[PDB]
């Protein structure tokens, strides 16, 4: 019960008052585990994170090549919950962002000051972003070793350390555009999920195709409801979930692609590059400034936890000073600059939304390549 000012999601906000108990109460589901890995061989390891180690593999009975997740010891509904986020969007028969566009429908939270953020542009299209969801096929626990495991789409994917520096400006357009597909989707769907960073987005460069996986650390948006603060990793954590302002929604996945965004742009890997929790914060105010940051503490009326008192008083720095030479051939343009500006905002209701940031100006090149 900590916060002083309430928050209500933008856009989507009443998803799961719309759905009921079987959609998103993923703690009184029962997993219909598969006894046996009888049907898969399970080949090399692929990939890791820290919650797990996924091997490459083919389902045996049509030969299509999958990956298995397995899964490290961590609290059971933390699994349930995985999974129910995994089938509620793969098992939607009608993709609510395949259907026409209803602005009513859209922007829910009618407060005035909320209001003011509606942005002049939008994508306003239906879209395929349930598509650029990652895949579940299966659900298995090996008898012996107990490990529960999650089978899903194989994506031929390299380290965007590796693939990242390659890609051309429009490139860039392209997958970005991709993602904020797949956060529309999972957004109109009532899910925030709560990881976006550069190793949940397979991409197979040859097959120009971008899959959002991870759905480990995903929640369903209830409205009021105050969460845990402690998910994403360092680097990516918004404001918010630094000053302990746990009544978030949508929006902190949208402070996450920014900083994936401004990270790609100026080449700076990771771009808020904190030393340590207290360090991280610092990192943010270091570049916009300290006068917003106060403004933000004063609207929601937040105690600041007690860390971060030892911060000096910085001033804004603009974007302009993130340009050199090695980045301008993706930095060098007013609409790029403004689009990380209108991302990266203290303030989650100051943020484009998925749709909003999808109609921006800097994606004008990819938007022309639909029709
Ligand atoms: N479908 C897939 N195709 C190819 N590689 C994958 C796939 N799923 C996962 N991987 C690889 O395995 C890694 C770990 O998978 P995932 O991110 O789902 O697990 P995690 O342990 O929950 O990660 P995090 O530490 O971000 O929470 C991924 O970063 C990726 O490199
Ligand atoms: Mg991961
Ligand atoms: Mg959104």
Same mark, same amino acid.
């Given at each position: ?48 994170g820290k919650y ?30 995985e ?47 349930? =598509?650029?969801? /990652? ?9 012996? $070793?107990? *490990?529960?495991? !999650? @089978? ?40 925030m999920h709560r990881d976006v960073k550069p190793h949940n987005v ?10 959002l996986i991870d759905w480990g650390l995903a929640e ?11 998910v994403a990793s360092?680097f990516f954590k918004?404001?918010?979930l ?10 902190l996945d949208?402070?996450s692609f920014?900083?994936m965004? =401004?990270?790609? /742009? ?9 030393? $340590?929790? *207290?360090?991280? !914060? @610092? ?89």
């Amino acid at each position: 019960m900590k916060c002083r000012v309430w928050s209500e999601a933008r856009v989507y906000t009443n998803i799961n008052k719309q759905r009921t108990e079987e959609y998103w109460d993923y703690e009184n589901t029962v997993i219909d585990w598969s006894t046996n890995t009888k049907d898969y061989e399970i080949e090399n390891k692929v990939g890791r994170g820290k919650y797990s180690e996924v091997f490459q593999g083919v389902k045996l009975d049509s030969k299509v090549k999958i990956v298995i997740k397995m899964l490290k010891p961590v609290k059971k509904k933390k699994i349930k919950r995985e999974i129910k986020i995994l089938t509620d969007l793969s098992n939607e028969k009608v993709p609510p962002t395949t259907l026409p566009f209803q602005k009513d429908q859209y922007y829910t939270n009618q407060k005035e000051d909320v209001l003011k953020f509606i942005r002049p542009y939008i994508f306003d299209q239906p879209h395929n972003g349930h =598509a650029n969801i /990652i895949h579940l096929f299966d659900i298995i626990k090996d008898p012996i $070793s107990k *490990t529960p495991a !999650l @089978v899903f789409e194989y994506v031929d994917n390299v380290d965007f350390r590796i693939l990242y520096p390659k890609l051309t400006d429009l490139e860039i357009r392209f997958y970005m555009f991709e993602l904020l597909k797949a956060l529309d989707y999972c957004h109109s769907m009532g899910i925030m999920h709560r990881d976006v960073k550069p190793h949940n987005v397979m991409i197979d460069h040859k097959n120009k195709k971008l899959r959002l996986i991870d759905w480990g650390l995903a929640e369903f948006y209830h409205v009021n409801m105050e969460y845990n603060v402690r998910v994403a990793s360092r680097f990516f954590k918004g404001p918010e979930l630094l000053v302990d302002y746990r009544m978030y929604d949508y929006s902190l996945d949208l402070w996450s692609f920014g900083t994936m965004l =401004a990270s790609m /742009i100026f080449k700076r890997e990771p771009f808020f590059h904190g030393t $340590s929790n *207290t360090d991280q !914060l @610092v990192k943010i105010v270091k570049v916009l400034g300290t006068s917003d940051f106060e403004k933000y503490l004063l609207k929601y009326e937040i105690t600041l936890p007690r860390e971060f008192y030892d911060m000096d008083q910085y001033i804004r720095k603009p974007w302009h000073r993130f340009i050199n030479d090695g980045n301008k051939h993706l930095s060098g343009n007013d609409e790029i600059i403004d689009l990380i500006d209108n991302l990266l905002r203290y303030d989650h209701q100051e943020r484009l939304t998925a749709k909003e940031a999808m109609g921006h100006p800097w994606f004008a090149p990819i938007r022309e390549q639909i029709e």
